Subunit: 344 residues, 4 copies
């Protein structure tokens, strides 16, 4: 088989999950009658210190229903220049909510509070209303970097003074929590809503969850219906979600250790990586000192049994997760070492 | 509890539960889930189309179809009492920026002539009619079957005008079972068809959209945008395969149970028209009862029967896999006792 | 050419041309155009409203109103043959992302009970009904006057449910002249009204929206987004002030001409209903002619008479300031000759 | 009041007022306004394009162009500080459902390589890059002129990828007078161009979009949808024709006044860069003043000079036909007095 370092989304269900899904107690969620979904949402709200939660088929929908519930047509959403909502969500914010993204550069996912402040639009007929500020914790593009709690706190203070909503794209908020030691409820305390994925490092086959106030979640639920996320006996999926949330968080530390090990060794080989920047499950490798670009290196890697994604023409992203063991990492490293000789 | 609210409440068969537990999966975003791929392969084959796309719900199936078939500002001709127009949260306006052009119909069948008259002529003031939608086994009219000839004639009109045709076939198999018309035959007269796996076919989640390759490619991107792009969705697809391949024939049982239920309810004295029961739905009027539909629904629940009121004077009863003949007979004994109380 | 196509073809009076040439202007984006400001003050005053907004067209007038009254996904109740649904290029769906909810009407008058029944109940499957629109002097039906009683009732219903009411008053003055109902009284039963200056009132460009200060503020911003935020628009407002203050009374002349036209056409043998002609429009059916509406329209054009077909069997004739009684007589001689050829 | 806020405040010349009063008009919706038709013919010819469209504002000109070049979910590459992104009410997201893709630029000139990298790869997660917009005489950077070579290289990239190119030429004639490059040459490297008549050219209302026949047809329909479809707009076009054919040359006077203003402000001690002033705009920084941009604008107003702050430390000064050398000289006396007070 292949050593899959493309993403943590490829994680497969554990034995415990397969069993729980196949024997899930279910109901029609449209009627709010699926017991497993209801327990998953109750558990999620509780974990994040929020009043309510909403299960969704993907993180993308989690983000989009949140944007829909937080905005009105013609509004502007302040977000990080390299955030997922801006680059990888098919421009849904424009089509679905009719809102404009207001890109603010960030240092490792951390937008400077004063830059966010300046990004807020003055009340002028020429300008749309800034109604939402979005923050991504463990910013993907920058290498799964951890946004400091103080950063989020400061932005919350600015949002409050202006009456602006705050949404945290916490797709990998648990990785951030494991790395920082900050409980997720703390990050959530400085936001109106938080979306987090169950289908990545937590290993569930499908789904993400949005948490927030009752009225917000009710609005998000209606948005979910409109977008087509209103499923029937979704308890089959939620069963795995419950296990992800309750038993797969602590072991994320193993993915971080594997990623750091990978980074340190890649550095020793001579690759352009920064082990000092690796705090969660991602490693960015630049092909600057290689005689091939990102795409060419990805092909050579595939040809040698290693799978990864090019994130630019000069950068590759390596992601660790439950289905890549330390031994798998060592195997990949031995291959990376030989390839270094070939392309250096 | 005897649940006659809708066929959406069907639960997974033992066969499905086993298949879900041992389902082979992969990341669908990369098109690497083997079970999802097989489900879509089977669905396309079944409806005689080039491709298929699995979606979380029928609503998304309809919406990605509309998006893939239209451009902002277009108009969509659809039946005045269709699900897309009534129960899809106005998604077509928000997601596709298109306007509905309601055409009345007789039990889901729009007069072909009225369809032709609803097509907008080319003029700067008018939107472009780019899609015509037909719902088979029309929900609101009481689960009626739209004649194949009606669909055939509308298709001809569409072709002559270069307009796409979408069949909302959430319950197209019920239509096929009742009419004897194969689903491929219905499909042949349409550009795309959405059908549900999560209703009478008993899958826990999902529907499927079938059509040409280019159409499906556009719909797949629309699905990503809407949030329907899942990961190891093979677990759901495993139940979906069983639903598509082995749960169709038994739909005849739901039809029989519905008719039997209607005939007996009429015998008791309830205001029902057994002659109108074509598929798995029975409409019950409450005009002769001491309490309206909402009050009667509560009496029913207290006695162990679940049903929905669709108006102050109407209740809809829906049969499905999880409503056996025994359950029907038990429900009738309850209806009998309640008639003595509320007539 | 005797132009009976629409009252939009009206050309500026000498008084207007002079007023435009000497118009005092400023930058409207800064709210500094004094002539625009006066036009809006006068418009608000005339309709008994708090504020007013000048727009480049009636279509923008209706659309900024819809945007200001609704949110994405909302539903808008409107008459089945209203201009907003048929002649505004599906703008409501694209610009506001809203769903139209057509309701049948008798010459523009929707039965109040049907409106009440069109209001969506609070359910996750349904959009929220946030607006009801009424067109006074309903175009399609032949410039018919909607009864004030009808408007009052719908207003009462709207209040109960907290729904906004917008009156498409493109020809509200024609309705007032014929009914004897002051435009301020019509306006009192609505949250917003759009009326045109560019039709019967003869201004070359523009309409105005009137309503509450906050609503107008939202409409103004919508106007900026749509591209209606002009600069020295006082040039157009000068003609607008004259249209609003000096051209209302003479509308009776267009009505007289329209009625006379209809009476004579009936005597010739054409399918018209002189008794239904109360303002400046005449609907002419072609069911008793050798050619349909499109064929008859071309014949009329070749003979010097311009009109538009509103369907395959109906032609709309409209009178206005640029059509004198003499022009009507000449037209009648032409219609007389064409009846011999096509009856 | 000496108005240096913008060139939008320009008022009609006597020649224009007379032309508007004597304007030959018609109903534009039927394409029958002779003056609008000639303005569009002239605009098209002037820019070396086959068609043109008159619009109520530059904002609508840009937006109908975006609508006609894109499909829902598309992405539009544009300069980070461009008007379309910052000053058009987020209209591109609402009207066309498209995403802006900001690219840094040096005085309006995006590096061609950056543009190349901003184009989205074909992937399900990414919107399709279907349009690249370029603003000539980039407003925010001080009315800077984008080099013809920059537009030429971007055009090559666009062609290579089958992507449309739109030039926001609101002040493209200022660019042409300063650079010596004919507007038809800039436009030769674009698919469409929008230019304003209501700014430095002194028309009271409007802009014009030029491009291919089909594109313009789509833009015309978009205009109808947005509410820009006017009637006897010839009154406005009459002034537009004069603006286009007689007000271009004198733009050099505005540039001369801007330069003179910059040189004297520098001489006084203000933070300005005369070397950066190539058209009708001067950027003044408040860095060496005991007050911020907002406080300074207030001081200028109390002394009789109007200007706009574009940031907390920068104010924009704009020259035009209604700010003569005398006014500049008078303004300088005020600036001199204020410098003593705030330095
Ligand atoms: C920060 C972030 N946010 C939102 C999403 C969307 O979730 P879905 O894929 O479930 O829609 C992703 C997925 N990112 C894919 C990856 O990093 O490989 C993500 O990384
Ligand atoms: C009732 C009504 N409402 C709104 C509009 C739109 O106004 P503009 O044409 O200025 O956009 C019209 C024009 N109707 C076309 C006609 O009767 O000739 C109309 O008749
Ligand atoms: C480059 C540019 N583009 C488009 C527009 C929009 O045109 P309208 O204002 O006619 O909609 C403006 C106006 N700019 C105002 C100013 O700079 O003072 C502009 O400067
Ligand atoms: Ca997974
Ligand atoms: Ca090893
Ligand atoms: Ca089911
Ligand atoms: Ca007119
Ligand atoms: Ca001007
Ligand atoms: Ca002098
Ligand atoms: Cl169960
Ligand atoms: Cl909204
Ligand atoms: Cl597997
Ligand atoms: Cl589109
Ligand atoms: Cl003036
Ligand atoms: Cl004229």
């Amino acid at each position: 088989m292949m050593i899959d370092l493309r993403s943590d989304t490829v994680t497969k269900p554990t034995e415990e999950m397969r069993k729980a899904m196949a024997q899930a107690e279910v109901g029609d969620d449209v009627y709010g009658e699926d017991p497993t979904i209801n327990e998953l949402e109750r558990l999620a709200a509780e974990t994040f210190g929020k009043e309510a939660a909403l299960f969704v088929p993907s993180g993308t929908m989690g983000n989009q229903v949140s944007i829909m519930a937080h905005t009105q047509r013609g509004d502007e959403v302040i977000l990080e220049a390299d955030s997922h909502i801006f680059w990888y969500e098919v421009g849904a914010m424009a089509v679905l909510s009719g809102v404009m993204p207001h890109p603010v550069p960030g240092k490792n996912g951390a937008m400077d509070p004063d830059d966010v402040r300046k990004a807020i639009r003055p009340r002028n007929i020429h300008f749309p209303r800034t109604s939402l500020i979005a923050i991504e914790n463990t910013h993907n593009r920058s290498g799964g970097r951890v946004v400091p709690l103080e950063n989020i706190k400061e932005i919350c203070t600015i949002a409050k003074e202006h009456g602006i909503n705050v949404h945290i794209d916490g797709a990998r908020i648990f990785n951030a929590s494991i790395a920082s030691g900050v409980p997720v409820k703390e990050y959530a305390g400085y936001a109106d809503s938080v979306m987090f994925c169950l289908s990545k490092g937590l290993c569930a086959p499908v789904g993400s969850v949005v948490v927030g106030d009752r009225d917000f979640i009710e609005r998000a639920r209606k948005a979910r219906k409109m977008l087509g996320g209103g499923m029937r006996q979704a308890g089959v999926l939620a069963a795995a979600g419950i296990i992800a949330l309750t038993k797969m968080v602590d072991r994320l530390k193993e993915d971080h250790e594997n990623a750091r090990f990978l980074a340190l060794k890649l550095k020793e080989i001579g690759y352009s990586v920064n082990p000092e920047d690796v705090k969660t499950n991602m490693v960015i490798l630049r092909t600057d000192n290689l005689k091939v670009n990102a795409h060419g290196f990805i092909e050579a890697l595939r040809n040698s049994g290693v799978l990864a994604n090019a994130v630019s023409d000069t950068e590759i992203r390596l992601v660790t997760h439950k289905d890549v063991s330390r031994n798998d990492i060592e195997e990949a490293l031995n291959i990376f070492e030989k390839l270094f000789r070939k392309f250096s």
